[PDB]
Design a protein around this nucleic acid. Structure first.
Lengths: 185, 541, 50
RNA sequence: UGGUAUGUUC
RNA sequence: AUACUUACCUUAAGAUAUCAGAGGAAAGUCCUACUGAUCAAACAUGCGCUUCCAAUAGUAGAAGGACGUUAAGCAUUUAUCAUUGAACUAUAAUUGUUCAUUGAAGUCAUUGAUGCAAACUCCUUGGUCACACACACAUACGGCGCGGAAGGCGUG
């Protein structure tokens, strides 16, 4: 036979660490004084967030981004940052239903098998990953512009030129209003 | 008539030329126009019409000004100029094409060296071109074909054969896609060693004696001593292979399996989101590894599918700013990114701030003059507000620094300068056609001094009152900004400002507008005047 | 050597791979237009007297 | 009385 | 392989050592397992012929390379032509000097080229033979061990 052959390798068995599609972030070490909106305000600018939830009393939370890129920017950006006087340990975690399935498999100790988080269905042309929109469009769809984006919660909206106004506009709102106390987050 | 005039009186040449001239950036028009010109020369020879050849050279060179990253057409214009006979112009076309890519391109270096081989005929200089090519493009993941070119030139030309070992030992450490082939060449080329002195080809004498315990000057029976030596060097190669195989299989499995498009297409092509994500992650990996030749090569290698986006022009600029500590480098990256990218607003913002850090304010004045000149001295009327607002902030910085202040306590008059205030009023006067009205009011509010508050109150608040513009009067943010202008005056006392807001301002707004104004105005009132919150509620019900 | 103008197959024509191209050296003789034997061959009649 | 070459048939 | 089909060809002549002598088919020709002399080739074979054939008692050396490194070594020297405008020096049509414009060609090089010189590293090649570790020589030097390489000369 020939001296050059293609390499072959074993699969690494699919937990939440070895899933390439996993976009949810386990934040651990939460301070129990921090709400879901206050944590959303921390993890918002890294991407668009499918959902943010905090288990009652369990001193940990989850943030589920839309992209893998956004989530890795989150884990690199906010690692050991003190959210309300307690340093925060970030890692990959699973969802809510997947966690319920792992706990019911942990009681019966039967299998503990995970399944893979869904992917977008490549190729997508409009989407530039890790890019956020806050709120009559005639788009020419030329490439530098961002034709498509995810609506904040959930829907698919086309970004425009006008949105760089709206974010700035909303920004001045939470500099003023949140200063007086009407949103702590 | 000749073949040129038969070409120039063709009906098609008019439409093809004219479509290119209408739509310069669309490139299917340029390719149809160029293919038609070249095909209407049935045989390109040294006697074909010199007017027609001059027309061909003008067409390709203008296309390579419009689209400077098309590698295949730099090669094709060089080969056409070769066929016509002058190898000097083909040299200059290859070097022009290498210059468009900052020397960092594998296809142009590969083709320029396969060309150069035939026509240099000076050996030191031919090899110095391979040593120049290797520092720019030699660490490319697909750069195996370059190293094949360099090794076949060495193995034909050199008589000594030490240069082959010295090149191949370097190639053994690069994590190339085709890394094994050069391991197989080293293994065969070790296996054919026929005595002890040849082992000084591999490394030095002292390293063999000290590290591997081989004596080349061993006099004795030399057969089994040589077999032992070859077994030891085959082991040390096995460990080096094992390292490089880990590198290459990691890079392939995460990143290079995922990228499908490696070449520039046209300013109108889109890239899938998957490839944008893996290019961003693959650049992050490269920046971690800290090989600067390879980081520059990978940014240049990444600009090919997505030159026209701007996320990598920004990213490459940021890497030069904070990881290499180089601001003139980052200015040159962003400045070149103006040429390519279609969006340009985030690049101009970041480039203004890079220049301001580099203390080069005259260049900032020239870029502000070119942006006001690009909109015909009429940036106030631009549809996209981000251009006007970034322009206006940095123009205000230059203007406060250029003209001394007119108001007390050295309070630099930002938007209250007759050059800038006229632009701001001219954009405020369009009322709904333009986009950024509340941001502009909300920054005009921020002056907080008696002389400044009086000017801002009289010129934009009283005047939009007396003109009766319904857009501003029904809008809650107008009244909120006006109350917030007066309330944060450091001059006026508390009873004075509460007296002014409740007694003078709040009657002026119409009662038809209450359903539009009361959400915002309440939000002022509860924030600062809880006591007067009855009065407001009584005034509008 | 991408192509073959010869009758042989490709493997046979790779065997006839030439040496590298010749280097250039400046000439030490006369350029082809300046070559001539002797002109100004002087006359034979001067001998005949003396 | 020949040679080399070509292609078909078996 | 056969066979068949076509297509392309089917030719410069002459000679085989020289000179002299005897014979055969007055001038010449031809020939003589005829005879002298010269020449040339092969093969044997010799010359007190001439030159050359590497430490191991040591880590060398000789011959020839490098299309090898130091090396951007050290020292010199090179990088277009025409047209038009502008300032400019001036004995001057504006000769000199600088800036831009149109056209024409244009090996790459300037880390080059050329001059000089040195160190270092490495390749190929050889009887790395035998007996010796020795007081020689004016006719200056036993050329009086076996081979090998190359020529010079002589004989058969």
């Amino acid at each position: 036979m020939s001296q050059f052959i293609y390499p072959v390798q074993q699969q690494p068995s699919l937990n939440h660490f070895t899933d390439p599609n996993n976009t949810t972030v386990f934040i651990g070490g939460l301070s129990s004084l921090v709400t879901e909106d206050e944590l959303r305000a921390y993890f918002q600018p890294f991407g668009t967030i499918v959902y943010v939830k905090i288990p009652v009393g369990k001193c940990c939370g989850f943030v589920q981004y839309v992209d893998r890129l956004s989530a890795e920017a989150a884990i690199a950006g906010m690692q050991g940052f003190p959210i309300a006087n307690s340093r925060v340990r970030l890692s990959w975690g699973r969802s809510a239903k997947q966690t319920a399935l792992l706990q019911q498999a942990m009681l019966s100790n039967s299998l503990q098998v995970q399944q893979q988080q869904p992917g977008l269905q490549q190729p997508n042309y409009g989407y530039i990953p890790s890019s956020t929109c806050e709120a009559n469009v005639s788009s020419t769809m030329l490439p530098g512009c961002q034709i498509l984006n995810y609506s904040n919660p959930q829907q698919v909206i086309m970004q425009g030129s006008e949105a760089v106004v709206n974010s700035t506009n909303a920004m001045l709102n939470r500099l003023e209003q949140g200063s007086n106390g009407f949103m702590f987050a | 008539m000749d073949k040129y005039t038969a070409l120039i009186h063709d009906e098609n040449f008019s439409t093809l030329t004219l479509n290119v001239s209408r739509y310069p950036k669309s490139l299917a028009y340029w390719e149809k126009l160029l293919n038609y010109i070249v095909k209407a020369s049935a045989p390109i020879c040294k006697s074909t019409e010199p007017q027609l050849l001059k027309l061909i050279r003008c067409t390709y060179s203008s296309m390579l000004n419009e689209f400077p990253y098309l590698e295949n057409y730099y090669i094709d214009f060089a080969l056409l100029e070769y066929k016509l006979g002058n190898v000097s112009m083909s040299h200059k076309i290859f070097q022009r094409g290498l210059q468009a890519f900052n020397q960092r391109s594998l296809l142009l270096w590969t083709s320029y060296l396969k060309f150069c081989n035939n026509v240099i005929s000076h050996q030191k200089q031919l090899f110095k071109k391979y040593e120049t090519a290797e520092e720019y493009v030699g660490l490319h993941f697909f750069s195996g074909e370059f190293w094949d070119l360099y090794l076949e030139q060495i193995s034909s030309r050199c008589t000594s054969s030490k240069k082959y070992w010295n090149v191949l030992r370097k190639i053994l450490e690069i994590p190339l896609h085709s890394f094994s082939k050069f391991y197989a060449l080293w293994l065969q080329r070790i296996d054919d060693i026929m005595d002890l002195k040849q082992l000084s080809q591999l490394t030095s004498k002292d390293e063999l004696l000290k590290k591997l315990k081989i004596d080349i000057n061993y006099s004795g029976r030399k057969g089994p001593y040589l077999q032992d030596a070859k077994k030891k060097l085959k082991k040390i190669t096995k460990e080096m292979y094992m390292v490089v195989q880990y590198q290459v299989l990691e890079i392939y499995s995460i990143f290079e399996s995922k990228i499908y498009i490696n070449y520039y297409t046209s300013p109108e092509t889109l890239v899938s989101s998957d490839e944008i994500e893996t290019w961003i992650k693959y650049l992050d990996y490269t920046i971690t590894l800290q090989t600067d030749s390879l980081t520059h090569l990978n940014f240049q290698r990444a600009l090919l599918p997505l030159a026209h986006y701007d996320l990598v022009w920004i990213k490459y600029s940021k890497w030069l700013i904070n990881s290499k500590n180089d601001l003139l480098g980052a200015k040159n990256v962003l400045l070149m990114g103006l040429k390519f990218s279609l969006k340009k607003t985030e690049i101009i913002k970041l480039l203004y701030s890079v220049i301001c850090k580099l203390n080069e304010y005259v260049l900032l004045r020239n870029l502000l003059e070119k942006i006001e000149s690009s909109y015909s001295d009429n940036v106030e009327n631009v549809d996209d507000f981000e251009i006007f607002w970034d322009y206006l902030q940095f123009k205000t910085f230059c203007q406060n620094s250029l003209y001394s202040s007119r108001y007390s306590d050295s309070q630099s008059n930002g938007l209250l300068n007759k050059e800038l205030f006229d632009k701001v009023w001219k954009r405020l006067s369009c009322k709904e056609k333009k986009s950024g009205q509340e941001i502009l009011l909300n920054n005009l509010v921020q002056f907080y001094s008696k002389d400044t508050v009086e000017f801002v109150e009289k010129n934009i608040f009283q005047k939009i009152i007396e003109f009766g513009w319904e857009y501003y009067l029904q809008n809650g943010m107008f009244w909120n900004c006006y109350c917030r202008l007066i309330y944060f005056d450091t001059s006026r006392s508390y009873l004075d400002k509460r007296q002014y807001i409740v007694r003078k301002i709040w009657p002026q707004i119409d009662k038809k507008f209450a359903q539009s104004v009361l959400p915002s105005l309440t939000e002022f009132c509860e924030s600062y005047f809880p006591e007067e919150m009855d009065t407001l509620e009584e005034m509008f019900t | 050597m991408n192509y073959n103008l010869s009758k042989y197959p490709d493997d046979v024509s790779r065997l006839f791979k030439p040496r590298p191209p010749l280097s250039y050296k400046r000439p030490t003789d006369y350029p082809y237009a300046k070559r001539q034997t002797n002109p100004n061959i002087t006359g034979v009649a001067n001998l005949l007297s003396t």
